[PDB]
Design a protein around this ligand. Structure first.
Ligand SMILES: COC(=O)[C@H](Cc1ccccc1)NC(=O)[C@@H](N)CC(=O)O
Ligand SMILES: COC(=O)[C@H](Cc1ccccc1)NC(=O)[C@@H](N)CC(=O)O
Lengths: 216, 216
């Protein structure tokens, strides 16, 4: 019926350790030894890092370890790293082949070094302009925290109009990425001098420009 | 690792009957009758919706069926109810360590017409190769539901590492558009026949190839 009361948040520090614990009743959790832990990364397939309460599949490292106490098991992670930022779930065998999960926890490894973005501007394909099209993409990546402001200007004065930015998403490196594209026209692209993309991240503005190259 | 595989998106309207797949071939023993189907709404904890190919726990409406087709675990949400729009995972238990998890299928009760992705592959601008670096940006715009799958190949052969994908973000036209990039040294760049990016999205599989002919 109900889930296994799991806290909604935790916080650790690079090298430290954090114990995420979920609780239930003496019917599902409290009765057996099948309290397992999952871990999916921000809207992405789950993964198992614990089973039979205190155990791990031949992949999860030695920082992962949970153990059942009362009617509540609990996982803890030391050697805390940035890549550990994620939502964890707790399961537990119920009655008639029934399995129950926790209410979820989102652990945030604090103390994570701050990064300034790396803006890469791109000129329309050698083939984009062949189909009578032209769109520029401002690749903002490798930055942290996860908030940024992307802006576009024409030959010098604002261009805001026909610009689509996307939310910032974590990468494989535990930092963020994010693009922003402009849709021009070969003609709305040629009849100019230089377009530029501006990325303001934590009081640190970056700004690359672009000009037409004949070849690619 | 992602042995089990499934559509990026599977959508329909009310009444319809979407049919998610779990074609986790990867050959396997081709005899793992333990396939589960976790349903994961947004902002909530997953939950076994079907288990053992086709067994259903207490609760689950008959609207759901489960089955293995040679090497294909499928699920069907006939009469697609509104409250059925979520992410639908799938799995097979292996070696008590290998809990392989599908990749996730996000159902969507159609809210607007279907919009296929508009991928445009970008090569590293000359000025960038003038900084001893290459970045290939794959821009995917104008689609729906907001669920895409991106693959990378260098010379036809997959590019399993160095690739980055963003998370679908609604555009001003409420049409999703994500972006994927692959960072590589000018050498890797120049040392390959042609580079290709190819997103997935409900049947269609548009792929764009880019050759390293650059001006620098
Ligand atoms: C997979 O565990 C089992 O084989 C089944 C339960 C089950 C099977 C398939 C899907 C959900 C639940 N049996 C068990 O887990 C039991 N061996 C353990 C217990 O009674 O606590
Ligand atoms: C029915 O719920 C299950 O499948 C669970 C957990 C699980 C998690 C992720 C992927 C597959 C299985 N599986 C089981 O209980 C069994 N596969 C393990 C056992 O028999 O002890």
């Amino acid at each position: 019926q109900s889930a296994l009361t799991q806290p909604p948040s935790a916080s650790g520090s690079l090298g430290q350790s954090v114990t995420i614990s979920c609780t239930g009743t003496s019917s599902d959790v409290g009765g057996y030894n099948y309290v397992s832990w999952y871990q999916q990364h921000a809207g992405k397939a789950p993964k198992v890092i614990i089973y039979e309460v205190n155990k791990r599949p031949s992949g999860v490292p030695d920082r992962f370890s949970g153990s059942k106490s009362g009617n509540t098991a609990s996982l803890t992670v030391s050697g805390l790293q940035a890549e550990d930022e994620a939502d964890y779930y707790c399961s537990s065998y119920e009655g008639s082949d029934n399995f129950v999960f926790g209410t979820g926890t989102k652990v945030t490894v604090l103390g994570q070094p701050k990064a300034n973005p790396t803006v890469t501007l791109f000129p329309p394909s050698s083939e984009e302009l062949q189909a009578n099209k032209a769109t520029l993409v401002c690749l903002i990546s490798d930055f942290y925290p996860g908030a940024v402001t992307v802006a576009w200007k024409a030959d010098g004065s604002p261009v805001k109009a026909g610009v689509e930015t996307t939310k910032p998403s974590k990468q494989s490196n535990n930092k963020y990425a994010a693009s922003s594209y402009l849709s021009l026209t070969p003609e709305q692209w040629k009849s100019h001098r230089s377009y530029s993309c501006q990325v303001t991240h934590e009081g640190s503005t970056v700004e690359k420009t672009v000009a037409p190259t004949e070849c690619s």
